Amino acid sequence: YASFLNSDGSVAIHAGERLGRGIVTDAITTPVVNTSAYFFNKTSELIDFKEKRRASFEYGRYGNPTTVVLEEKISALEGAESTLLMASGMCASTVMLLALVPAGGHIVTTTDCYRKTRIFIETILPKMGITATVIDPADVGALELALNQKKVNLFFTESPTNPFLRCVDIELVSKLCHEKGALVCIDGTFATPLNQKALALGADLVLHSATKFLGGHNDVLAGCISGPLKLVSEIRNLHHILGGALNPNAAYLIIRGMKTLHLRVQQQNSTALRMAEILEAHPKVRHVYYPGLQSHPEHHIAKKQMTGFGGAVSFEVDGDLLTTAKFVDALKIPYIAPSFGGCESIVDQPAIMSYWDLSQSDRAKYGIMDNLVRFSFGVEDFDDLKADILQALDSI
Amino acid sequence: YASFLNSDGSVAIHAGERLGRGIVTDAITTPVVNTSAYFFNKTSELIDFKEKRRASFEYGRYGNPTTVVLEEKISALEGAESTLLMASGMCASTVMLLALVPAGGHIVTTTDCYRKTRIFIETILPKMGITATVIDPADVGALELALNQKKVNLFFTESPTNPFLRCVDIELVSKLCHEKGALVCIDGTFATPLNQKALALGADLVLHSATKFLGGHNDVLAGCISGPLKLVSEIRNLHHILGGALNPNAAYLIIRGMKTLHLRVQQQNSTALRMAEILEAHPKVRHVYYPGLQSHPEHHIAKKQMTGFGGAVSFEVDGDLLTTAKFVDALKIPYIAPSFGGCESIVDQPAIMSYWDLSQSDRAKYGIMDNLVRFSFGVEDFDDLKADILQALDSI
Amino acid sequence: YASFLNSDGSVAIHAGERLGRGIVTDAITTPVVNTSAYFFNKTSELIDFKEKRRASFEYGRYGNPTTVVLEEKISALEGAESTLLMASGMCASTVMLLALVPAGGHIVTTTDCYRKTRIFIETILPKMGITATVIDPADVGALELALNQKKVNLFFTESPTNPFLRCVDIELVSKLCHEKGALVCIDGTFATPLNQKALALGADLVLHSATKFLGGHNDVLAGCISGPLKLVSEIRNLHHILGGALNPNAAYLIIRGMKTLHLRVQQQNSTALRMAEILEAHPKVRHVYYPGLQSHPEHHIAKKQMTGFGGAVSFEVDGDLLTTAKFVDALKIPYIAPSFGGCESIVDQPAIMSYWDLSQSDRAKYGIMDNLVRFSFGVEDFDDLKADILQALDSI
Amino acid sequence: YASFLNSDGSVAIHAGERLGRGIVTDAITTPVVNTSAYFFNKTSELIDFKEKRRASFEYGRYGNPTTVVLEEKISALEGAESTLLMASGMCASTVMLLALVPAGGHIVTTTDCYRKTRIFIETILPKMGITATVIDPADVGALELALNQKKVNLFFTESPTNPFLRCVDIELVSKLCHEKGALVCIDGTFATPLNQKALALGADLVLHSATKFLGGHNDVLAGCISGPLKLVSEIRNLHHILGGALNPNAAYLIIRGMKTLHLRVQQQNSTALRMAEILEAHPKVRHVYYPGLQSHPEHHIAKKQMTGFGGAVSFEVDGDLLTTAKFVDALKIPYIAPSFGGCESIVDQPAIMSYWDLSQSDRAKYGIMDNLVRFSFGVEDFDDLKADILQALDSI
Ligand SMILES: *Cc1c(COP(=O)(O)O)cnc(C)c1O
Ligand SMILES: *Cc1c(COP(=O)(O)O)cnc(C)c1O
Ligand SMILES: *Cc1c(COP(=O)(O)O)cnc(C)c1O
Ligand SMILES: *Cc1c(COP(=O)(O)O)cnc(C)c1O
Ligand SMILES: O=C(O)c1ncccc1CP(=O)(O)O
Ligand SMILES: O=C(O)c1ncccc1CP(=O)(O)O
Ligand SMILES: O=C(O)c1ncccc1CP(=O)(O)O
Ligand SMILES: O=C(O)c1ncccc1CP(=O)(O)O
């Protein structure tokens, strides 16, 4: 974006605003445009726009002035060519898949894929004849193999993963894929464009869930997809049809929340790391998952491709479904709810929160244990948070 | 909804508010809830919810207090069992189709189908092996024939139609379809739940584009699908995956706009009718399309299943692409833009506005003429509008 | 404003938007500008603005792009030279008084003055030595007398009045006051800029409470003051110091609500009138107050300076505090609350609602009877409303 | 507030929300309540509320659910008994002055008082016979003298001061005042409830300007007044008449902004201090103002009653009106505008920005030099900022 703006924090603030907005004003902030359509002065100009000689969104489903600002902002952060914003993260992945993978094509992902996204790939895509290969996050051989057996169209995965924060060597993975013509998409939701530049490491596309860290206030939903124009534009087209447009009000709520992205992330990164160690050393804590820890499987990877390790920390308590529940019920600061990344701390038992519909055996079939607890550290003072977590574990 | 409320106008105002809200308040209006998730007091309760013993949206993608109000509101008007709201009309149709029509299945629609909706059906659905039969809005024999030849899954169409406002005998069409097991979905955007009750006439589902008349202020987009629970719920499920959630801020903007629905519709209904006749009798106007006119192909049907004929009026000027434009360029009150149904009057040349990408020949291939002009009468004073249209016509 | 615009309805919609906004956009609606300050490109320009060579609001407390629109909009309706918008109606009257009336000066108002306003004039102004003469709305002799005895600075009153909707011959009163140099300010809240033009009748300043009819949806508070520049500017200056600025989000909610002012007012005007007569003829109704009725004291004046008679109707039930309450408690459509002018209907007993702090004797000291009931007719269907009122009247 | 939260940061986040809201929900954030009035179920209950047996706001001008949350939140931070929120900072001071000081009373303030506030005290208050004594911020003897000569009603001042960030020994000043029965009001705007607790130091009332640091995003205006109930309630009463109510939307924007108050403040405190030194050592900088420096007149006081020194830094460049301007015109990150405290950095020449109307002689008569430059450090990265300031300093 700007030369005088070299830090990501400065970018997250003035990116797409300080130098101009396209919607002129002497105001410091971006104006919210609540319009469903855009007019033209005369039929002559309408034709001009229709003939690529003029610029206009024409209709609200094809864009919005207050929305593009956030599109450019995130684009600068990720250092992408273009960024597309949708109603939600799910909408982003969904549309992207439906737009890039052709019928009958093949897809490759990890076993730790977000549940809902797994369902979409195992129940909807097959309808278009799309087949998929599910490998382990670390199993690079499996990827290389599948890369040769069938013709892979695109390798999709998130890093860190949910809920075990498993990381993928983006640089490597990308190289293997591009070697066989496969595409690579990374869901850096947990990471944040501040803790890692998936695009700079080789990924073709990087999508986020503004609902989490980008918004950071737990009050709005949004989808994010950044990458090269040639690509992002293909998705944008299908988007203009499926109509999963983001409301201008929401767009501003995110622009606003991003003004303090770096500040929030910085604090969440510490509290998370510091509390992880404390938890790891705790006698009542059986296992702790965090890329920052030395005990993490891909700790060497995370350390090589990340500058931070996120504010999300998962760990298994030394008890059972009931005891573990007793622990979370004891906390007093975090909310017992889904989602994560907001100023307010949140806790939940993935076993109950997102897999209660399955049987204990089917649950265990995929790592989720009644022991697993996912803590999303807010922005509250460390001491207050630490004391709370400890006070809770005591009752166990 | 209420017994003391026997009129749609009264309903559109208090339906889903006067009796209760689920979100208690001594406030007259519905509170906007800007949240991404919902918390639980204790693991115990969380389980209860998961075991269908307690109620909660859990996550913002699965619902919202300020959104269900609008959902119940619209459900009362259409006299439906349940209503689902999306980010936009296109999202509504799109999701509904992907959810109800199975792979390899067959679909039936009209030739006047909304352009973008046509594209989705002719380029995306085929990927799932879904084939379609396109018939003329009036050709009931074609429908009956198709109903017997191939196994029709669902008959989709809008009524009135765009831009020639063609109408379908909903009652009849429903009968034929249901006889063969087909589903019927009517797009009553142009109509409005006030001018007709597609659900009462026999349709299974009725969808709208709150972006138009329901909102009425040209400042927000939204999708609408009302129908039986068994059906609408199936859609809601795929919706929870595709993630086309509607923002609470937008949901309120619609709730508010609907408070004056009946009043707006009433006025537009008149302005349109009166202006249509005046236009028809005008020497410079070659043809006029409006269900309210006796010259309309299905005026008899419109008169039998409608109480109003919308505020949209299409007509052909006595000139060419250039002359017609000169007419619209002379208008001073309406805006030259897409969309319709807002308090502000709008005008456009479908030919240019939504078919400029096609050749003159390919355009004529489907009724669109450089002569056609679609007028969306706002809520301005009739005399002011009439005088403007006349003064303008006085130039061609 | 516009030449092609000759009807208030059309004006209330496009006034201050259709021709230009000062904040350029190809958007149909007015954009919301959420800013606390406005920047300058270079010290040179800042100086220009300070030297009155350039335009700018500088600070949010001094103006806002999305607010002026509303200022100009209302200015057109009242045909005023300039309009000022504040936080609330009380804010407007308050600031206006403090600004125009000098210390030790004298004021003249009616006995039916709005309570709160009465308190301000009887407890605050005296601190600045400002004395006041209170006369009866109709007593023109008293006004003329006071006009000669003391040196009146400004005559302030509302018309219709609350809650007895008393009217004042603006034309006459204005004439008498201007003869002695006194200023005249009318509070046309109940009337609405559609039902009467106080400015055209001779008044110097006309103020409203957008909170009521202008907003029309019972979801925002705002003040209104329209009149000559020389005058309104003087108020604006004190405003910039007392800081009762109006939030941009609020300004838009009103701009939006006004797009259907004429439509709403039209409907309320009828329902009110019709329901007034029905009520008058009812055996259980002792008295009914409404300028539209022939039994109203200033019906001849109302009939001469108004085109409508508002949507507010006051009447006394044939019972007591307890009985009358039983009546309002029987209603099902209207809300038991203060305020009026919104789409939703509202009822209340001034006695209890705004005079419960006074003794029965002190209450009757100024017309308020435990009998009095103020009905604010919403926009719901007449039949639904009528049936409701009549039904609850069969339980007395 | 809470016993498990002892840090201000955690307080600024959950204060007034984590334990309850008064407006029940399972939502994590506070709901925005857009309503002008509040209803009652039956006349019986209406009476209960009027007789202090039930709770209700009755009318929007008297309170709002989404507003009180902010009232209680700031109350916790300041450790006050109650907080009142208005439309703007000016409103707060103005109303607090008109409510606490009686007619003919005496007031005491400093020479560095906020300009607009000075005007109000020097032009409006005298109309009520209220006289004032202006002393120098440091001059304690003057205060002690004035405290004995005339009968001081209230001593009002800010600390730090604008623009020379002069500080006042709150503890001391409080003692002398209370000894003679005077009241003490501190405008801790520049300080922020995080850097100092004027209330705990002895102040009777501490008022802010949420428009600055509290909101921290330069997109909303708001006034703050915290202190004991007996006192704050007296103001709230006059407030209910002057009608400077705060819009719920604005209230939410602050509640949200305060979620990252500590984070923002923390960063701004550093940058400012660090840059303050570098600037002081700079050869082109003649003088620097900042309570954090050892060169500041009341650095010993600042150090004893503050934990931070604000993000505002004033300094004089080695040049003239024209040269100084050249420097600000060279900057690229901060905006040239009024206000301060937001994420975005801002700069201005008080001489031009707020004193251009006065003569060079009249300006200097009160310290304002054509040299003075007030820098409001945003939240951008220090390095980026530092480099910018330096770069524009070499242009000189
Ligand atoms: C948040 C999230 C999503 C989906 O985001 P929505 O906002 O719910 O649409 C998908 N994947 C991961 C890994 C997430 O954390
Ligand atoms: C407006 C409209 C749609 C699509 O609405 P969106 O709000 O753009 O999704 C579909 N069909 C018809 C007939 C419409 O008029
Ligand atoms: C509504 C009203 C006011 C004050 O309006 P607010 O919105 O409460 O500030 C003053 N006078 C009359 C006659 C009103 O009806
Ligand atoms: C910002 C400020 C005020 C007034 O704030 P407004 O938002 O302009 O009302 C008063 N005093 C000081 C010292 C301020 O910094
Ligand atoms: O708890 C979760 O796993 C989660 N994470 C992110 C977004 C939403 C959720 C909730 P779920 O999938 O159970 O519907
Ligand atoms: O102009 C139209 O046909 C129209 N109508 C309704 C909604 C949106 C549009 C614009 P588009 O060309 O992109 O289809
Ligand atoms: O009921 C009323 O008198 C009324 N009217 C208009 C606005 C507000 C009110 C309520 P209050 O008693 O507080 O003055
Ligand atoms: O620049 C200022 O002095 C300032 N400070 C705080 C709030 C507002 C301002 C702008 P003004 O010139 O009008 O006083």
Side-chain angles (χ1 to χ4, degrees), chain A residues 23 29 83 99 125 130-131 159 181 183 191 193 197 294 303 324-325 344:
Chain A
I23 191 273
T29 64
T83 287
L125 296 182
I130 286 146
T131 158
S159 167
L183 274 188
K197 314 275 160 152
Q294 292 241 213
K303 219 196 211 137
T324 298
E344 296 95 338

Side-chain angles (χ1 to χ4, degrees), chain B residues 126-140:
Chain B
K127 290 191 194 184
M128 336 225 303
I130 286 153
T131 155
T133 284
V134 180
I135 74 168
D136 180 274
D139 194 342
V140 188

Side-chain angles (χ1 to χ4, degrees), chain A residues 2 132 135 169 200 203 250 382:
Chain A
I135 68 157
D169 193 327
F382 179 159

Side-chain angles (χ1 to χ4, degrees), chain B residues 26-27 29 31-32 34-35 38-39, chain D residues 26-29 32 34-35 38-39:
Chain B
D26 48 339
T29 70
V32 186
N34 281 298
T35 191
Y38 308 76
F39 71 85
Chain D
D26 49 348
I28 282 147
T29 67
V32 187
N34 282 303
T35 189
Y38 305 104
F39 70 84

Side-chain angles (χ1 to χ4, degrees), chain A residues 109-147:
Chain A
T109 57
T110 78
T111 36
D112 275 59
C113 202
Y114 181 64
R115 182 129 204 251
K116 240 92 249 267
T117 307
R118 182 102 183 240
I119 295 175
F120 174 81
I121 309 175
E122 283 186 343
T123 73
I124 317 292
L125 296 182
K127 290 186 185 189
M128 341 214 316
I130 286 146
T131 158
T133 278
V134 179
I135 68 157
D136 179 281
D139 199 333
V140 187
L143 174 78
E144 197 172 358
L145 182 58
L147 241 341

Side-chain angles (χ1 to χ4, degrees), chain B residues 329-343:
Chain B
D329 277 15
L331 298 156
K332 310 225 204 96
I333 294 170
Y335 284 105
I336 303 185
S339 209
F340 58 79
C343 305

Side-chain angles (χ1 to χ4, degrees), chain A residues 21 23-39 55-57 252, chain C residues 21 23-39 55-57 252:
Chain A
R21 246 167 287 234
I23 191 273
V24 206
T25 30
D26 48 344
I28 291 139
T29 64
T30 295
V32 188
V33 176
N34 285 302
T35 196
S36 72
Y38 307 83
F39 71 87
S56 172
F57 296 117
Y252 177 79
Chain C
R21 247 174 285 237
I23 194 278
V24 204
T25 32
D26 44 351
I28 284 151
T29 68
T30 288
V32 189
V33 176
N34 279 301
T35 195
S36 77
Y38 307 84
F39 71 87
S56 170
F57 301 118
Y252 180 79

